[PDB]
Design a protein around this ligand. Structure first.
Ligand SMILES: CC(C)[C@@]1(O)c2ccccc2-c2ncccc21
Ligand SMILES: CC(C)[C@@]1(O)c2ccccc2-c2ncccc21
Lengths: 342, 342
């Protein structure tokens, strides 16, 4: 066919990173489905081909594994689905309707990528070993692959949710940070009560530096923020409950939401006994956190996706602090995308 | 002369990193000045030549500057001072006495290296600019150069303090961490009261996981721990006082000392308004923290010298946490030394 042909062509284009303000203004009242179709039918192949060409640069030891080939076949098929709309007339309403239906099929086709790549990592460790040189290659590639996957899913979610026939797609222009914190806590508390028959309480403190009274709002994607907070709440609850099985007092989980002139920071403090520094630095490694699991590495990619970060600093024998760093301003929240270079 | 000859010879040897337990046991009752002389007359040239050969690999743009040449002339002279004792008889007490006097002269000859390298960094920025590529080369070299300098000064201090004619040289086998914290605080409070006419209070909390009652002691070099804590106290006081000039309540500085099964962690928490994440990552850069200053970068090297670390995580609009990570066990406290490789 022409799959290698399409990859080489669109990989020469660099992806166009969009800011949070561009996502908001494009999806507002002046939202034209035709304009979004013209942009996405070009930008989606560019992002697909860039990561698909980097997959080809992997060694044949990994490229010929069933896990990588299965995922690579999904990207080939999804790329071909977009190719059909290149010559189609954007002025035809049937063209726009079929394009939205085709994006949903691609989205559901890539729904089982996280467990599949986890099987690939386990296969590599049992086939070639777990050397620090291999960990860097796997960490470097999986970070770029997943971040690419997040960005593509973002574009698809914004198109299918807006043009379905307050919230701008998956974006809340007035996202109350504390409310998302409570939701992720409540879900983690539900799971923690069913399995441990006990759960720590929650304490939330807001620090709005410029407006001490005003609640802290931001423009963000609540799903991404929930995923990070839910993952951090599960870890902090597991550590708190297990480190106090012989004790009676169950320390609460303290969360501070701070809004500065540039950052919106969310610190989650637990007293779950802490973790030695040697092990903290390996909690974000796909290879080291795989056993015959990727909550922290993926959660950090969600934060980094809009120029943020997620950092851990523990104190062995006491507890652990987890901090989500987000950009406060929508103009500073720009997509971080991997680009194929030589 | 034969200065390039000695450099090429001893640079082929790798430095021998010593653990904290080796420092303690060698300097104990079975401390033989002859054995320390035989080791140091070989190990000191090896460490000198390794960093001196890496200095030669610098570009001639930096190698020909007066700052680098002045420091390089100190290392050439100090290397030649040790060469005189290679053929001397260790069984002669006059040989051991002159060797100790020669180490003191070398130690005082290298007393003005930090301000000299600071002048070199400022000269480079005004001569060739402050590009991110140049920052990595300067950061990579200065970290290794200073860490090498710390290790050499450590060996000299242990020899001159022990064989001068409870503490094992510069090492306290029962170093009370909280007491060093109070000393660094008291000195910072003295300077802060004279310049700001106000200073925050101190709060210390110890978490001894294995022995909740016992005070937290360790085997460490109190001078190094004081230098790190004093630097962090100055920053936390400056930020706290200045961020509350229009306010009346002056938040205290909270310090937690946690002793785990592997780590001894010291967290210093202030409410000095915090720093955006973008600027935190540049506080450890020699090039970015230079103006027409190196407290944090050098303090981190002291921590890393015995397999520890010093990390910052702030929250803009609230405050900053600073954490010193140290190895709890003396067997895990091994010298981290840069080695000249190809
Ligand atoms: C921001 C893009 C992902 C988007 O595809 C989009 C999604 C949803 C709503 C509108 C628009 C849009 N408008 C113009 C150009 C490009 C686009
Ligand atoms: C640990 C070394 C720096 C040292 O030079 C030393 C310093 C002080 C006291 C004793 C000894 C010693 N003893 C044996 C071998 C080597 C040495």
């Amino acid at each position: 066919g022409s799959a290698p042909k399409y990859i080489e062509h669109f990989s020469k284009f660099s992806p166009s990173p969009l800011s949070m303000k561009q996502f908001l203004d494009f999806g507002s009242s002046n939202a034209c489905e035709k304009t979004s179709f013209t942009f996405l039918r070009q930008e989606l192949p560019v992002r697909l081909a860039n990561i698909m060409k980097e997959i080809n640069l992997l060694p044949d030891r990994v490229l010929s594994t069933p896990s990588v080939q299965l995922v690579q076949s999904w990207y080939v098929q999804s790329l071909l689905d977009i190719m059909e709309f290149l010559d189609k007339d954007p002025e035809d309403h049937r063209t726009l309707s079929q394009f939205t239906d085709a994006l949903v099929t691609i989205r559901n086709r890539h729904n089982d990528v996280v467990p599949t790549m986890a099987q690939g990592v386990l296969e590599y460790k049992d086939t070639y070993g777990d050397d620090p040189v291999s960990n860097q290659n796997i960490q470097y590639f999986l970070d770029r692959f997943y971040l690419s996957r997040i960005s593509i899913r973002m574009l698809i979610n914004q198109h299918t949710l807006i043009f379905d026939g307050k919230h701008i797609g998956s974006i809340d222009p007035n996202c109350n940070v504390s409310e998302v914190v409570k939701d992720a806590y409540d879900m983690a508390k539900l799971l923690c009560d069913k399995y441990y028959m006990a759960s720590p309480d929650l304490e939330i403190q807001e620090i709005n530096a410029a407006n001490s009274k005003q609640p802290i709002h931001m423009v963000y994607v609540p799903s991404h923020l929930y995923h990070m907070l839910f993952e951090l709440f599960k870890n902090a609850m597991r550590a708190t409950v297990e480190s106090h099985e012989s004790s009676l007092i169950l320390p609460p989980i303290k969360v501070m939401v701070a809004l500065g002139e540039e950052d919106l920071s969310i610190k989650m403090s637990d007293r779950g006994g802490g973790v030695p520094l040697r092990k903290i630095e390996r909690l974000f490694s796909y290879m080291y956190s795989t056993a015959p699991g990727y909550g922290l590495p993926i959660s950090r990619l969600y934060a980094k996706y809009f120029q943020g970060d997620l950092q851990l600093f523990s104190m062995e024998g006491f507890g652990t602090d987890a901090v989500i760093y987000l950009k406060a301003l929508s103009t500073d929240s720009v997509e971080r995308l991997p680009v194929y270079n030589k």
